[PDB]
Amino acid sequence: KETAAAKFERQHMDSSTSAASSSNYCNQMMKSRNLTKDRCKPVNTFVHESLADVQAVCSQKNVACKNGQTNCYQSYSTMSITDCRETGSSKYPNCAYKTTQANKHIIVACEGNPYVPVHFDASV
Numbered sequence: 001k002e003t004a005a006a007k008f009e010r011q012h013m014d015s016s017t018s019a020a021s022s023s024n025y026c027n028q029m030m031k032s033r034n035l036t037k038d039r040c041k042p043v044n045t046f047v048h049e050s051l052a053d054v055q056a057v058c059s060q061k062n063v064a065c066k067n068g069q070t071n072c073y074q075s076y077s078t079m080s081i082t083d084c085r086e087t088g089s090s091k092y093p094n095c096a097y098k099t100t101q102a103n104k105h106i107i108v109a110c111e112g113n114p115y116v117p118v119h120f121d122a123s124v
């Protein structure tokens with residue numbers, strides 16, 4: 001079973017580019033990270049900083065998670081991210097996403113040893 005830490009990297013980590021190059025980044029990334037598998041994952045964010053920078057958020061600003069747990073952390077700095085959101089028109093298995101480049105603070109939930117992000121809670 002893929003660990004939560006590994007799933008996070010699959011779903012949300014893309015250190016390759018430092019931002020979304022093309023307008024159909026989301027279409028490719030959502031496919032290649034297996035997020036369009038049995039359905040279209042409607043919303044997903046990709047983060048474009050080093051794994052080490054993202055992992056480090058786990059020792060930054062402690063905040064409540066949406067689900068009300070206390071193991072969430074907000075990045076001190078803004079980060080290069082990309083919001084993928086399914087278009088009004090999209091339909092499985094032809095999944096369609098708008099790509100939006102952004103610089104925002106990320107909020108992640110951290111777990112395990114080592115203490116690393118396991119959930120992407122929000123960007124702000």
Ligand SMILES: Nc1ncnc2c1ncn2[C@@H]1O[C@H](COP(=O)(O)O)[C@@H](O)[C@H]1O
Binds near residue numbers: 065066069118121
């Ligand atoms: N570690 C986590 N911290 C906060 N919310 C989570 C976590 N894992 C999953 N969730 C989010 O909550 C949903 C499942 O409910 P729960 O994990 O119990 O809060 C998932 O669809 C996620 O959006």
